[PDB]
Design a protein around this ligand. Structure first.
Ligand SMILES: COc1cc(-c2cncc(-c3ccc(C4CCN(C)CC4)cc3)c2C)cc(OC)c1OC
Ligand SMILES: COc1cc(-c2cncc(-c3ccc(C4CCN(C)CC4)cc3)c2C)cc(OC)c1OC
Ligand SMILES: COc1cc(-c2cncc(-c3ccc(C4CCN(C)CC4)cc3)c2C)cc(OC)c1OC
Length: 287
């Protein structure tokens, strides 16, 4: 039995503090290879521990292929190998692309579907999982118009890293340090907040009556680039600001319904927020 492990790294499609992602080739097929920085080894360990616990398989979860640790002279090399989505991240896609009603709904319902799959405990199955870093850069666009959720490096599991989430997307109870850290439902409610921000980013790019908004990240109008923890706490907790809903949305039945959904993801009180399952149901009754 020959075990062909060679992956050809062809082009770098992302670089950050986390490390790099490459388009690679295995046996003639594209794969995505995440090479971790020493800085973020704990993200590789957590994603690997999760997949060693439960082999997630869902059309709206980035598909796992392999976790590799390789001994080097003076270091350990850590790779995560996944399915490759050539259209790139939702963040990337929304910069130039506008959406119609069908494509907007298909994107956001596919995300809700992936998120509900993470959140739900299945007996027999899977533990319940909270993501803890949901954002448009951690969502990939598939050729079929659905998305998938990536990066379980901060995920938490329930049955019975010093990395923290992206500050721009942190829920109020994270910023004001009131989150009940011993309560699994707390982490689901943090994901729902972040989902609502992603819903807003997508809805802005849906055309209605010949109008569309430019791509902006959540809170673009009230915080700097690379906002501090304090910048975010003042906006979200002290002033209790929420992203703007443009007037033009209220002429479109889809965007009107999506604005109501966003509102119900953004309550200050975490336990008032909708569940991923209720978001899916609401999205299936829109249009
Ligand atoms: C170790 O490393 C890597 C391996 C591979 C890879 C390459 N060919 C064949 C395999 C294979 C799968 C499954 C079995 C089964 C069948 C027989 N029996 C009932 C249980 C065992 C055997 C062999 C693998 C796993 C790819 C890699 O990258 C994509 C690897 O590195 C990350
Ligand atoms: C890691 O990833 C990929 C792996 C492979 C791959 C390569 N050799 C052998 C296998 C295999 C054969 C047989 C069994 C089972 C089936 C019967 N059962 C009762 C026990 C044994 C499992 C595994 C696979 C799956 C192909 C891939 O792509 C086409 C992979 O994806 C990149
Ligand atoms: C978020 O997280 C992970 C993501 C991925 C991943 C999987 N498919 C495709 C991509 C990708 C491809 C291409 C572009 C751009 C670059 C060129 N041009 C400007 C248009 C297209 C962007 C993105 C990625 C980054 C893999 C991961 O692990 C292996 C990730 O980490 C879990």
């Amino acid at each position: 039995r020959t075990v062909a492990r060679d992956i050809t790294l062809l082009e770098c499609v992302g670089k950050g503090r986390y490390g790099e992602v490459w388009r690679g080739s295995w046996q003639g097929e594209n794969v995505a290879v995440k090479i971790f920085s020493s800085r973020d080894e704990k993200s590789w360990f957590r994603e690997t521990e999760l997949y060693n616990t439960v082999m997630l398989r869902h059309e709206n979860i980035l598909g796992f292929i392999a976790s590799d640790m390789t001994s080097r002279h003076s270091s350990t090399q850590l790779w995560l190998i996944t399915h490759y989505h050539e259209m790139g991240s939702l963040y990337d896609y929304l910069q130039l692309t506008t959406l119609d009603t069908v494509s907007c709904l298909r994107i956001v319902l596919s995300i809700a579907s992936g998120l509900a799959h993470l959140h739900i405990e299945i007996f027999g199955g899977k533990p319940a999982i909270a993501h803890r870093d949901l954002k448009s850069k951690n969502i990939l666009v598939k050729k079929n118009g659905q998305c998938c959720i990536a990066d379980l490096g901060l995920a938490v599991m329930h049955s019975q890293n010093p990395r923290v989430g992206t500050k721009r997307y942190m829920a109020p109870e994270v910023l004001d340090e009131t989150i009940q850290v011993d309560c699994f439902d707390s982490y689901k409610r943090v994901d729902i907040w972040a989902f609502g921000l992603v819903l807003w980013e997508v809805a802005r790019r849906m055309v209605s009556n010949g109008i569309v908004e430019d791509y902006k990240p959540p809170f673009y109008d009230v915080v700097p680039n690379d906002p501090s923890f304090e910048d975010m706490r003042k906006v979200v907790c002290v002033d209790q600001q929420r992203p703007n809903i443009p007037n033009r949305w209220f002429s479109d039945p889809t965007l009107t319904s999506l604005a109501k959904l966003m509102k119900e993801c953004w309550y200050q009180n975490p336990s008032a927020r909708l569940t991923a399952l209720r978001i899916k149901k609401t999205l299936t009754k829109i249009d």
